[PDB]
Design a protein around this ligand. Structure first.
Ligand SMILES: *[C@H]1[C@H](O)[C@H](CO)[C@@H](O)[C@H](O)[C@H]1NC(=O)C(F)(F)F
Length: 339
């Protein structure tokens, strides 16, 4: 069986019969985990094992950015700094910042893989204009060059553990004022202005960028549709001008900014038609199940290639081996001293 276009979540800390039904649906391709799915490492590993036992080709992801966005913070998961902290270190010591960024990525990826997780939805590539509270300290730096090189260093650390990455929120959530969870933000700058700064990290990263999540933001001078529903942003700019061939995941369609003029299913259809390879439906699995069964048919072969390439690569150390690894311990000691 092959991955479908829908990433959803499960109801609890252990899999239910309803979960298993959804996980077996052809249009399911991923599971995203949140804090409520975590009690301890043993429980989490059993949960991810049981998910893959139902759907071997499934992709399991989580929001592990660090700082204010890190679902698992206890039972041995290292509480990671906010990415803004690495930009502040950069302003004191550029090279040391790149070294610490890689150490963060390696800790981040290695701990998640020890619990059977494929990937984290990181790094944030939004620029730290100071305008966006929802991003806030989740952004690395104000300078797109600095964001690029810090994010690349982080992604290198993730790769060291075989983990991919996913930049967000394309083409940039840093300039708009509002929070797309609860409102519909807007960005009234020109296309060229947006491309010169906010999009430059996506272009400069090249092959070091594995995937993208678009923002639920309306860039009124470029397209009236939010970026995640915009063929202009996802195909004309990201796939065309930038030549990007990695996976595109929609930001959560349950968010207020994603409610356009109809149902969740129609929003999913629109995101996929616009250029998303996967759509996320979070915090309402029964509503996700309606999307699974109502999704309009579409060409998916090119999408499936990209989705499978987001699976973690190679073997992963289990916790009992990782806790003793010199490289893991070196990275832990660097984080404690440099910050
Ligand atoms: C939308 C979704 O919540 C996904 C998956 O949970 C996040 O990775 C993503 O960061 C998020 N969007 C935002 O936080 C923001 F900034 F766009 F509002």
């Amino acid at each position: 069986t092959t991955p479908g276009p829908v990433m959803l979540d499960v109801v609890g800390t252990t899999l239910s019969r309803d979960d298993a039904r959804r996980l077996a649906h052809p249009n399911t391709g991923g599971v995203i985990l949140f804090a409520r799915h975590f009690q301890n490492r043993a429980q989490l590993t059993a949960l991810t094992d049981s998910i893959r036992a139902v759907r071997e080709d499934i992709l399991i992801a989580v929001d592990h950015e660090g700082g204010r966005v890190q679902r698992f913070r206890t039972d041995g998961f290292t509480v990671l700094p906010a990415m803004r902290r690495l930009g502040e270190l950069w302003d004191r010591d550029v090279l040391l910042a790149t070294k610490v960024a890689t150490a963060v990525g390696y800790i981040l990826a290695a701990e998640l893989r020890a619990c059977g997780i494929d990937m984290s939805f990181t790094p944030v590539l939004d620029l730290d204009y100071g305008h966006s509270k929802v991003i806030g300290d989740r952004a690395f730096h104000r300078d797109p060059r600095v964001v690029t090189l810090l994010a690349k260093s982080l992604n290198h650390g993730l790769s060291l553990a075989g983990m991919a990455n996913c930049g967000k929120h394309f083409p940039g959530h840093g300039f708009a004022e509002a929070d797309s969870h609860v409102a519909l933000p807007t960005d009234d700058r020109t296309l060229d202005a947006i491309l010169e700064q906010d999009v430059a990290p996506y272009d400069w990263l090249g092959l070091s960028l594995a995937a993208v999540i678009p923002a639920h933001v309306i860039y009124t001078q470029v397209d009236k549709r939010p970026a995640g529903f915009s063929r202009v942003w996802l195909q004309d700019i990201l796939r065309g001008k930038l030549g990007f061939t990695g996976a595109i995941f929609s930001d959560d369609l349950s968010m207020e900014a994603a409610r356009e003029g109809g149902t969740l299913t129609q929003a999913a259809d629109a995101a996929l038609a616009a250029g998303c390879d996967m759509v996320l439906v979070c915090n309402q699995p029964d509503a996700a199940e309606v999307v699974l069964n109502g999704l309009k048919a579409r060409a998916s072969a090119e999408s499936v290639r990209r989705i499978k390439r987001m699976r973690a690569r190679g073997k992963a150390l289990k916790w009992d081996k990782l806790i003793a690894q010199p490289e893991y311990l070196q990275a832990q000691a660097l984080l404690s001293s440099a910050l």
